[PDB]
Amino acid sequence: DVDTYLSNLQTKTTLSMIADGLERSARDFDAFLEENVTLEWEAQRKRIYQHFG
Amino acid sequence: AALIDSAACSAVPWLGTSEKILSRVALAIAQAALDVYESTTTWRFRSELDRSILVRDVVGLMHKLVVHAHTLSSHLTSTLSPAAAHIISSFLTPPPSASSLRFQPLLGTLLVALITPRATLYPGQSRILAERVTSVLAFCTSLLRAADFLGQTHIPLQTHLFQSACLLARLPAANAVYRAPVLELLRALVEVAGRAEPPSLLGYLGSHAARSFISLVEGIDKPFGRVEHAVVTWRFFAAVIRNRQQWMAGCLLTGRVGEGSVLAAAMERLREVKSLDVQEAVAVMDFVVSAQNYWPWTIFAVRKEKEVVDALRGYVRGLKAPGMVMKTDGAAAAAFQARIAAYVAETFAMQLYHMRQMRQAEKFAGELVADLDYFLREGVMVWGYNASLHGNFARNFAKRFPGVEVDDFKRTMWLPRELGKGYYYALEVAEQMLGFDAGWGGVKQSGFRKEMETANLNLSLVEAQVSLFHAWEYLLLELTLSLLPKKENAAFARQVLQVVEQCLEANQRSQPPENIFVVLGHARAGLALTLLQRLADANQLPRDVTHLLALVSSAIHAVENPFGANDLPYFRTLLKILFVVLRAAKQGVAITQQVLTILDRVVARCFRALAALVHTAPEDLALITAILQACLSVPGIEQCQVQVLNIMAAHDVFQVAVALFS
Amino acid sequence: DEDELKQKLQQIDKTLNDPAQGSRLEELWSRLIVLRGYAEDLKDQINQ
Amino acid sequence: GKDLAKMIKEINDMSNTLSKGSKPDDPLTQIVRVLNGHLAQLQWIDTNAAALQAKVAAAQK
Amino acid sequence: TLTDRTYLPPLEDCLTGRTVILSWRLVASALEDADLARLTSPALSTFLRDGFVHELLKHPARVFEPKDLKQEFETKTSSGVDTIKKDALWLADAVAINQVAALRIVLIEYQTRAHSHLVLPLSTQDVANIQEAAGILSLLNPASAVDAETMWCDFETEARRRERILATYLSERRSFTAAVDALVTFLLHSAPGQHKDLDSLRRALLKDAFAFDEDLDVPDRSKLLTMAPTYMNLVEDCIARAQALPAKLGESFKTEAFELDWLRTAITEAVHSLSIAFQALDLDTPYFAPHELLSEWFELMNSSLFLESILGFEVVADLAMPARSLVSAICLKMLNIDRTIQFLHDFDYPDGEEPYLLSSQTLNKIHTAVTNAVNSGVAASLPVAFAWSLIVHQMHLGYQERASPYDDFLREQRLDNDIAPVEQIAMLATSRGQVYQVMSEMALCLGTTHEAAFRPAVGARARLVFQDLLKRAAYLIPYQDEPVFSLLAILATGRQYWDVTDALSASSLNQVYTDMLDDETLFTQFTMQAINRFPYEFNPFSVLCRVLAAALITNKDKADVV
């Protein structure tokens, strides 16, 4: 385990890698909003399908 | 030197003087002192003590001149500004022909010190030489800091300071007194080598000499165990590790794992923080973080191999760390405890990130989440700024000192700000600058000194709170991903909701100043944003928006409506926060009356402002559209459609929408 | 011809026995260990 | 040379483990490595061929 | 129930580094710099508060007296230890010290190898870097400079290791002497307004070692007054080792450098012993010291020629001058010219202690010692000889008015009828103002200025004997410029203008100054005459006003005298 950990290690500050979580969140939020608005359009269409009958 | 010291007190006896006269006299004095310093390398004294005293005096004068110029940034330090400026221009970027004439005196002093024999007699000469060495070291440090400041990319003095450190590595061997000053100098040289690979220090020191110096310094004041020399050696180690030094860092961490390395003793000190002085604990934790962020594979490995002694002590510290410690016995220890907790949280977050990368962070995180009580108490809440006493002190100082203001004592960032009573206000200088007239001393240790000390302690506490904020933000951000499964959901959701509520309440309550600390706008909004994001991804919310949205609405109402102003990130993050909040509400009636305010006053106003400005805009308009779409989906709206028809028709949004569509 | 030999030897020996050249490696090693720790941490974080 | 070799090895270890560390017996790092080999050999070919090409200009007197 | 646990911690701690033994170097440094943090540190606090360290510092001879502690050595060395044990055994076989002390010194040297290596000559690359920096300043030695490889390979050798061990042994001896001296100084002449922790530590150390309690109206000086012979007897072994190196030591190590180092160490140890004795003596200024000890001390000085045999070399002048000054100071102290004249003129018994005045043998010994010293042609004996001559000049007249034990002396060496020898000695001493010049030099080396060889309090308490000598000698020899310049160089010492501070110190340190305004002899003869000779004789009055204004800044009772 330690062998692979040292093999795949990069010379750089650790506090910068964890920071990437912010970027990843900012890039996931977009897709999450797109899923919100798609499940919303879906819901709306559904309620219309239950309005017409 | 006495003339310069007297001129330093520019806050006052002085009939027959003026700023220009004092400035010219100081410039002439600086020129004369520099000429003497350049000429002393040629005279032949009957003995070495005379030249030593002369060098000590001139170095002390130059140091007092340099520090006085950068210690403050107000007009109080303008009388000696042409002089300090001259000395700096002549000791940082001298001509190449007379560059060595200004450096040979220091080299000769270091040589004479490193080859003076040890003697039990003649204590006068010994103390004079010690003071001379300390003055030379302080002057070197001041020059290094001055070069680091003002944006100096090419420092020709560094080439000579390296070969001077070549001697300073052995100089402490003659006298232990030099161990702290020397290390300080080295720390400042390393700092100048960071913001400027650098010249390999091992090439100047040497393998054997470097190993001997490491074996001498690794033990932090073991025979006595003082706090000053300890914080000094811990800051030195942190600075040496933070820079690109790799050979020295490896020899200091490994010790040639670690059996006699600095870390072997740092763990021995960490396992007794419950009784150790909080002042030294901060420096020890800073060293730990500096060794982890740059050399994690060693520090984290050793800590996991010995976690049975560190995790227990961390849990003990966390459980018995009250939040409001001001009211209890102790006022200055609050900032120290907050800084210690912030460093502990940062280290926990880093080791949890490493374990997650190694896929061994489940049990450790599950055991640590039960220790976040101190965080829930004094974490994201930064309302401990107590602007009341700060404003009172400012008014009392402006009423008694019309000319000098309270903000004039702000540090110029020349030296790393201490997390003590001198974080923002320069007390070391104020003690000698305002102590000439009655009012500073005060009866029964009262007056302006105690109030300034309390204000500095409060600012240090706020800084420690911000550090803990960042640490806990990272920790919780990684834990939200770690604790994805369906367990410990109750306490987890409770903690997240409490954090969000504390953030939203602090966003409304009194804000801190923007000139002292960093603007909080957009700094603590994304935290709650991502928290609610991940909690919605997990779908484990108690649909308790009935009260959570009130704070967001109050913030959106009392934000001055900077829809398109410079505060665009703040507006966007607030919009995303309210979006996720109203989405969580949709998943859940008394909700419609509480959510119609955003549909009536917020969405319409922002849409009209955007339509009027557009005559940046695309993403904001898309976010507003998504907000309205997700807000029109709440179940409470399918019945209040009648009630909302009029509010939606009053602004005639359809006209502007069709216009922009054209 | 000894002079030439010790001249070459002195040149290469002088080139090797330099503070900077010797220091670069030491600096590099730590400079690597930084990335080692950073990568290992960021790896453990994204070890899912 | 030995220490430098150790360094390079460790760098390889860190890069390889960082990029992938849940299957060190996989075919990706395989393709990477073999493909690197090919790159190096191709470089050798290119350079030496260029050298020989240069050597011909001398005969063009 | 006095073990060496805190004194000599287990070898496992010394080797693993979990507890660095508090060597005498660190204690001496902390006591010399008067650092608050170090002196109040837990480690040093527990080390000094232990009764074992108290018994050791009260009996330094036992610290190096040859004993058979083979059992203790084996028990300590059992439960890199083989080399440590071998070095300890070799050192114990070479020097007469016990095996425990040798083992402790070897452990301290092992812990201090970094310093011993860093204080060595630099390598070739360092010399090259220094030359590059230089572009006067020629304090290097490139002719002998070598690379680091050959410097380290030679450092780990056996001969070099043994030489370093011996050097560390000598350094630790000097450090122990300086540390005990500074400790006695701080415990006897503690400055006021110090931190509460320092006062508490002082009171604890006193009550534990000497039972000296400040809340008692009469503290127990017995255990503090018994520290004079404890070191006057050790000075014998010091001079014996100075005049003869260890025989069991290998001849290969007995080189010029080693001989010079041994001589310097012996001189430093003798100076520290003399200083400790002078301190323990001035602790009780008015009362006399036991004549049984002064007899042996004067016999010792007679035999050794006032340490002129070991100090006769020209390479120990820097250490000889202060050594001679301190010898003269302690001689004048034990002589008590002031109290001696008071007793000879008052005839009332002091009751503090019996003086040598009632023993004719001691008087004969002192007289023959002074005669031998003056015949040998040495300057260090100038003030002591002059003083003794004055005493004899007062005894002669005391006999003329009575024409009792001193009569035996006066008639034993044929000193009753003729007064030629003492008169000739005084004439030679006063010729060319040699006595005054040597006294001024001693005061300079025993003052408070940065040129002084000892601490400020040491010189402040050492100038008292010279001031008393000038007091009793002023009414004998008339007023003249030479004695005045001598007293000026004594009281002022030649310090600078910025050497004046308002730092409040113990009254004892201010005694040497206030005496000028306390005793009528030093008031109506020097101060009054100096004021009357103004501005004609400007330097005396000026320097007197300067020193008075510099010394009476905090003394509110005499702040408006200048």
PDB file of N, CA and C in Angstrom, chain E residues 268-333:
ATOM      1  N   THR E 268      42.248  29.092  35.758  1.00  0.00           N
ATOM      2  CA  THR E 268      40.847  29.481  35.880  1.00  0.00           C
ATOM      3  C   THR E 268      40.223  28.893  37.140  1.00  0.00           C
ATOM      4  N   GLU E 269      40.520  27.625  37.433  1.00  0.00           N
ATOM      5  CA  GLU E 269      40.001  27.007  38.648  1.00  0.00           C
ATOM      6  C   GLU E 269      40.516  27.722  39.889  1.00  0.00           C
ATOM      7  N   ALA E 270      41.803  28.080  39.899  1.00  0.00           N
ATOM      8  CA  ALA E 270      42.356  28.797  41.042  1.00  0.00           C
ATOM      9  C   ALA E 270      41.695  30.159  41.203  1.00  0.00           C
ATOM     10  N   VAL E 271      41.456  30.857  40.092  1.00  0.00           N
ATOM     11  CA  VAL E 271      40.816  32.168  40.160  1.00  0.00           C
ATOM     12  C   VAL E 271      39.397  32.036  40.700  1.00  0.00           C
ATOM     13  N   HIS E 272      38.662  31.020  40.244  1.00  0.00           N
ATOM     14  CA  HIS E 272      37.296  30.838  40.725  1.00  0.00           C
ATOM     15  C   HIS E 272      37.271  30.465  42.203  1.00  0.00           C
ATOM     16  N   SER E 273      38.204  29.618  42.643  1.00  0.00           N
ATOM     17  CA  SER E 273      38.290  29.300  44.065  1.00  0.00           C
ATOM     18  C   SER E 273      38.591  30.547  44.885  1.00  0.00           C
ATOM     19  N   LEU E 274      39.537  31.368  44.422  1.00  0.00           N
ATOM     20  CA  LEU E 274      39.863  32.598  45.133  1.00  0.00           C
ATOM     21  C   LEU E 274      38.662  33.530  45.194  1.00  0.00           C
ATOM     22  N   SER E 275      37.892  33.609  44.108  1.00  0.00           N
ATOM     23  CA  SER E 275      36.716  34.475  44.098  1.00  0.00           C
ATOM     24  C   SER E 275      35.655  33.969  45.067  1.00  0.00           C
ATOM     25  N   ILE E 276      35.426  32.654  45.093  1.00  0.00           N
ATOM     26  CA  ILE E 276      34.455  32.090  46.026  1.00  0.00           C
ATOM     27  C   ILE E 276      34.892  32.351  47.461  1.00  0.00           C
ATOM     28  N   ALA E 277      36.193  32.217  47.733  1.00  0.00           N
ATOM     29  CA  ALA E 277      36.696  32.493  49.074  1.00  0.00           C
ATOM     30  C   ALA E 277      36.509  33.960  49.435  1.00  0.00           C
ATOM     31  N   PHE E 278      36.816  34.864  48.501  1.00  0.00           N
ATOM     32  CA  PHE E 278      36.634  36.287  48.761  1.00  0.00           C
ATOM     33  C   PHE E 278      35.173  36.610  49.040  1.00  0.00           C
ATOM     34  N   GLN E 279      34.258  35.972  48.310  1.00  0.00           N
ATOM     35  CA  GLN E 279      32.835  36.195  48.543  1.00  0.00           C
ATOM     36  C   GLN E 279      32.424  35.697  49.923  1.00  0.00           C
ATOM     37  N   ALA E 280      32.814  34.468  50.268  1.00  0.00           N
ATOM     38  CA  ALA E 280      32.477  33.929  51.581  1.00  0.00           C
ATOM     39  C   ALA E 280      33.097  34.753  52.701  1.00  0.00           C
ATOM     40  N   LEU E 281      34.212  35.430  52.426  1.00  0.00           N
ATOM     41  CA  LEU E 281      34.847  36.267  53.439  1.00  0.00           C
ATOM     42  C   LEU E 281      34.124  37.600  53.591  1.00  0.00           C
ATOM     43  N   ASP E 282      33.867  38.291  52.477  1.00  0.00           N
ATOM     44  CA  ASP E 282      33.173  39.570  52.550  1.00  0.00           C
ATOM     45  C   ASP E 282      31.730  39.415  53.011  1.00  0.00           C
ATOM     46  N   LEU E 283      31.164  38.209  52.915  1.00  0.00           N
ATOM     47  CA  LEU E 283      29.854  37.969  53.511  1.00  0.00           C
ATOM     48  C   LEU E 283      29.837  38.398  54.973  1.00  0.00           C
ATOM     49  N   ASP E 284      30.941  38.173  55.682  1.00  0.00           N
ATOM     50  CA  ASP E 284      31.133  38.628  57.058  1.00  0.00           C
ATOM     51  C   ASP E 284      32.316  39.591  57.044  1.00  0.00           C
ATOM     52  N   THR E 285      32.033  40.863  56.775  1.00  0.00           N
ATOM     53  CA  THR E 285      33.068  41.876  56.607  1.00  0.00           C
ATOM     54  C   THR E 285      33.666  42.303  57.945  1.00  0.00           C
ATOM     55  N   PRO E 286      32.853  42.717  58.924  1.00  0.00           N
ATOM     56  CA  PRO E 286      33.452  43.291  60.141  1.00  0.00           C
ATOM     57  C   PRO E 286      34.198  42.275  60.986  1.00  0.00           C
ATOM     58  N   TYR E 287      33.677  41.060  61.118  1.00  0.00           N
ATOM     59  CA  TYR E 287      34.315  40.065  61.965  1.00  0.00           C
ATOM     60  C   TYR E 287      35.537  39.469  61.269  1.00  0.00           C
ATOM     61  N   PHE E 288      36.427  38.902  62.077  1.00  0.00           N
ATOM     62  CA  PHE E 288      37.657  38.299  61.586  1.00  0.00           C
ATOM     63  C   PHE E 288      37.431  36.839  61.206  1.00  0.00           C
ATOM     64  N   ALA E 289      38.312  36.336  60.345  1.00  0.00           N
ATOM     65  CA  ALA E 289      38.296  34.942  59.934  1.00  0.00           C
ATOM     66  C   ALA E 289      39.156  34.106  60.870  1.00  0.00           C
ATOM     67  N   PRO E 290      38.921  32.795  60.934  1.00  0.00           N
ATOM     68  CA  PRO E 290      39.728  31.949  61.827  1.00  0.00           C
ATOM     69  C   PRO E 290      41.199  31.980  61.441  1.00  0.00           C
ATOM     70  N   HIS E 291      42.045  32.332  62.413  1.00  0.00           N
ATOM     71  CA  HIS E 291      43.477  32.428  62.150  1.00  0.00           C
ATOM     72  C   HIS E 291      44.071  31.082  61.758  1.00  0.00           C
ATOM     73  N   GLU E 292      43.464  29.981  62.210  1.00  0.00           N
ATOM     74  CA  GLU E 292      43.973  28.660  61.856  1.00  0.00           C
ATOM     75  C   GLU E 292      43.956  28.438  60.350  1.00  0.00           C
ATOM     76  N   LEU E 293      43.050  29.107  59.638  1.00  0.00           N
ATOM     77  CA  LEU E 293      42.982  29.002  58.187  1.00  0.00           C
ATOM     78  C   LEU E 293      43.908  29.992  57.492  1.00  0.00           C
ATOM     79  N   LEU E 294      44.025  31.211  58.025  1.00  0.00           N
ATOM     80  CA  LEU E 294      44.923  32.188  57.421  1.00  0.00           C
ATOM     81  C   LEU E 294      46.373  31.740  57.543  1.00  0.00           C
ATOM     82  N   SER E 295      46.725  31.103  58.660  1.00  0.00           N
ATOM     83  CA  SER E 295      48.068  30.554  58.825  1.00  0.00           C
ATOM     84  C   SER E 295      48.429  29.625  57.669  1.00  0.00           C
ATOM     85  N   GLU E 296      47.604  28.595  57.458  1.00  0.00           N
ATOM     86  CA  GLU E 296      47.831  27.659  56.362  1.00  0.00           C
ATOM     87  C   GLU E 296      47.797  28.346  55.003  1.00  0.00           C
ATOM     88  N   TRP E 297      46.915  29.333  54.819  1.00  0.00           N
ATOM     89  CA  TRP E 297      46.868  30.003  53.522  1.00  0.00           C
ATOM     90  C   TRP E 297      48.147  30.786  53.253  1.00  0.00           C
ATOM     91  N   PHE E 298      48.659  31.492  54.261  1.00  0.00           N
ATOM     92  CA  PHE E 298      49.903  32.229  54.080  1.00  0.00           C
ATOM     93  C   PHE E 298      51.086  31.294  53.893  1.00  0.00           C
ATOM     94  N   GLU E 299      51.082  30.133  54.554  1.00  0.00           N
ATOM     95  CA  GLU E 299      52.130  29.148  54.293  1.00  0.00           C
ATOM     96  C   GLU E 299      52.049  28.636  52.860  1.00  0.00           C
ATOM     97  N   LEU E 300      50.830  28.396  52.375  1.00  0.00           N
ATOM     98  CA  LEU E 300      50.642  27.951  51.001  1.00  0.00           C
ATOM     99  C   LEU E 300      51.177  28.989  50.025  1.00  0.00           C
ATOM    100  N   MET E 301      50.798  30.253  50.223  1.00  0.00           N
ATOM    101  CA  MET E 301      51.249  31.306  49.321  1.00  0.00           C
ATOM    102  C   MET E 301      52.762  31.465  49.391  1.00  0.00           C
ATOM    103  N   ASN E 302      53.337  31.369  50.592  1.00  0.00           N
ATOM    104  CA  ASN E 302      54.788  31.424  50.731  1.00  0.00           C
ATOM    105  C   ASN E 302      55.446  30.337  49.897  1.00  0.00           C
ATOM    106  N   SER E 303      54.920  29.114  49.979  1.00  0.00           N
ATOM    107  CA  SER E 303      55.530  27.998  49.268  1.00  0.00           C
ATOM    108  C   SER E 303      55.389  28.168  47.759  1.00  0.00           C
ATOM    109  N   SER E 304      54.188  28.513  47.294  1.00  0.00           N
ATOM    110  CA  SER E 304      53.914  28.592  45.864  1.00  0.00           C
ATOM    111  C   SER E 304      54.373  29.898  45.226  1.00  0.00           C
ATOM    112  N   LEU E 305      54.863  30.862  46.009  1.00  0.00           N
ATOM    113  CA  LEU E 305      55.298  32.152  45.478  1.00  0.00           C
ATOM    114  C   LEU E 305      54.119  32.907  44.865  1.00  0.00           C
ATOM    115  N   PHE E 306      53.009  32.937  45.604  1.00  0.00           N
ATOM    116  CA  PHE E 306      51.793  33.624  45.167  1.00  0.00           C
ATOM    117  C   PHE E 306      51.402  33.205  43.752  1.00  0.00           C
ATOM    118  N   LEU E 307      51.506  31.905  43.479  1.00  0.00           N
ATOM    119  CA  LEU E 307      51.162  31.330  42.181  1.00  0.00           C
ATOM    120  C   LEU E 307      51.995  31.920  41.046  1.00  0.00           C
ATOM    121  N   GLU E 308      53.115  32.571  41.369  1.00  0.00           N
ATOM    122  CA  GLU E 308      53.970  33.132  40.331  1.00  0.00           C
ATOM    123  C   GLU E 308      54.734  32.059  39.568  1.00  0.00           C
ATOM    124  N   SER E 309      54.889  30.865  40.144  1.00  0.00           N
ATOM    125  CA  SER E 309      55.575  29.791  39.435  1.00  0.00           C
ATOM    126  C   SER E 309      54.744  29.295  38.258  1.00  0.00           C
ATOM    127  N   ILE E 310      53.429  29.175  38.443  1.00  0.00           N
ATOM    128  CA  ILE E 310      52.569  28.731  37.352  1.00  0.00           C
ATOM    129  C   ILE E 310      52.176  29.901  36.459  1.00  0.00           C
ATOM    130  N   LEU E 311      52.096  31.108  37.013  1.00  0.00           N
ATOM    131  CA  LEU E 311      51.761  32.303  36.251  1.00  0.00           C
ATOM    132  C   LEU E 311      52.986  32.996  35.669  1.00  0.00           C
ATOM    133  N   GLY E 312      54.191  32.500  35.957  1.00  0.00           N
ATOM    134  CA  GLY E 312      55.395  33.120  35.435  1.00  0.00           C
ATOM    135  C   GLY E 312      55.489  33.101  33.924  1.00  0.00           C
ATOM    136  N   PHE E 313      54.807  32.161  33.272  1.00  0.00           N
ATOM    137  CA  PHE E 313      54.855  32.081  31.820  1.00  0.00           C
ATOM    138  C   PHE E 313      54.269  33.342  31.197  1.00  0.00           C
ATOM    139  N   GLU E 314      54.714  33.643  29.981  1.00  0.00           N
ATOM    140  CA  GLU E 314      54.257  34.817  29.249  1.00  0.00           C
ATOM    141  C   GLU E 314      53.022  34.545  28.399  1.00  0.00           C
ATOM    142  N   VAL E 315      52.562  33.296  28.330  1.00  0.00           N
ATOM    143  CA  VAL E 315      51.395  32.940  27.532  1.00  0.00           C
ATOM    144  C   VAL E 315      50.122  32.893  28.372  1.00  0.00           C
ATOM    145  N   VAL E 316      50.200  33.266  29.650  1.00  0.00           N
ATOM    146  CA  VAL E 316      49.036  33.257  30.530  1.00  0.00           C
ATOM    147  C   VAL E 316      48.870  34.631  31.167  1.00  0.00           C
ATOM    148  N   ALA E 317      49.376  35.669  30.497  1.00  0.00           N
ATOM    149  CA  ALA E 317      49.269  37.019  31.043  1.00  0.00           C
ATOM    150  C   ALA E 317      47.813  37.441  31.184  1.00  0.00           C
ATOM    151  N   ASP E 318      47.000  37.185  30.154  1.00  0.00           N
ATOM    152  CA  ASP E 318      45.588  37.547  30.217  1.00  0.00           C
ATOM    153  C   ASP E 318      44.899  36.905  31.411  1.00  0.00           C
ATOM    154  N   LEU E 319      45.323  35.701  31.797  1.00  0.00           N
ATOM    155  CA  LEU E 319      44.784  35.031  32.974  1.00  0.00           C
ATOM    156  C   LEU E 319      45.620  35.260  34.223  1.00  0.00           C
ATOM    157  N   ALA E 320      46.880  35.673  34.074  1.00  0.00           N
ATOM    158  CA  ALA E 320      47.729  35.917  35.235  1.00  0.00           C
ATOM    159  C   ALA E 320      47.386  37.243  35.902  1.00  0.00           C
ATOM    160  N   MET E 321      47.242  38.306  35.109  1.00  0.00           N
ATOM    161  CA  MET E 321      46.909  39.623  35.638  1.00  0.00           C
ATOM    162  C   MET E 321      45.670  39.544  36.525  1.00  0.00           C
ATOM    163  N   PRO E 322      44.540  39.025  36.029  1.00  0.00           N
ATOM    164  CA  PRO E 322      43.375  38.876  36.915  1.00  0.00           C
ATOM    165  C   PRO E 322      43.624  37.923  38.069  1.00  0.00           C
ATOM    166  N   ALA E 323      44.404  36.862  37.853  1.00  0.00           N
ATOM    167  CA  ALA E 323      44.725  35.950  38.946  1.00  0.00           C
ATOM    168  C   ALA E 323      45.501  36.670  40.041  1.00  0.00           C
ATOM    169  N   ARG E 324      46.520  37.441  39.657  1.00  0.00           N
ATOM    170  CA  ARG E 324      47.290  38.191  40.644  1.00  0.00           C
ATOM    171  C   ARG E 324      46.416  39.220  41.351  1.00  0.00           C
ATOM    172  N   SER E 325      45.537  39.891  40.603  1.00  0.00           N
ATOM    173  CA  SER E 325      44.650  40.872  41.219  1.00  0.00           C
ATOM    174  C   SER E 325      43.746  40.217  42.253  1.00  0.00           C
ATOM    175  N   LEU E 326      43.183  39.053  41.926  1.00  0.00           N
ATOM    176  CA  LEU E 326      42.288  38.381  42.860  1.00  0.00           C
ATOM    177  C   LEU E 326      43.049  37.844  44.066  1.00  0.00           C
ATOM    178  N   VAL E 327      44.283  37.379  43.858  1.00  0.00           N
ATOM    179  CA  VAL E 327      45.112  36.948  44.983  1.00  0.00           C
ATOM    180  C   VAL E 327      45.354  38.119  45.928  1.00  0.00           C
ATOM    181  N   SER E 328      45.719  39.276  45.372  1.00  0.00           N
ATOM    182  CA  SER E 328      45.916  40.458  46.203  1.00  0.00           C
ATOM    183  C   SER E 328      44.632  40.843  46.925  1.00  0.00           C
ATOM    184  N   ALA E 329      43.492  40.730  46.241  1.00  0.00           N
ATOM    185  CA  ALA E 329      42.219  41.091  46.854  1.00  0.00           C
ATOM    186  C   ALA E 329      41.913  40.193  48.045  1.00  0.00           C
ATOM    187  N   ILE E 330      42.067  38.878  47.871  1.00  0.00           N
ATOM    188  CA  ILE E 330      41.766  37.959  48.967  1.00  0.00           C
ATOM    189  C   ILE E 330      42.770  38.124  50.102  1.00  0.00           C
ATOM    190  N   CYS E 331      44.032  38.426  49.780  1.00  0.00           N
ATOM    191  CA  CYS E 331      45.016  38.672  50.829  1.00  0.00           C
ATOM    192  C   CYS E 331      44.636  39.896  51.652  1.00  0.00           C
ATOM    193  N   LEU E 332      44.300  41.001  50.981  1.00  0.00           N
ATOM    194  CA  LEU E 332      43.891  42.200  51.702  1.00  0.00           C
ATOM    195  C   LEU E 332      42.598  41.973  52.474  1.00  0.00           C
ATOM    196  N   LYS E 333      41.715  41.114  51.965  1.00  0.00           N
ATOM    197  CA  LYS E 333      40.477  40.811  52.673  1.00  0.00           C
ATOM    198  C   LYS E 333      40.763  40.066  53.971  1.00  0.00           C
TER     199      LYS E 333
END
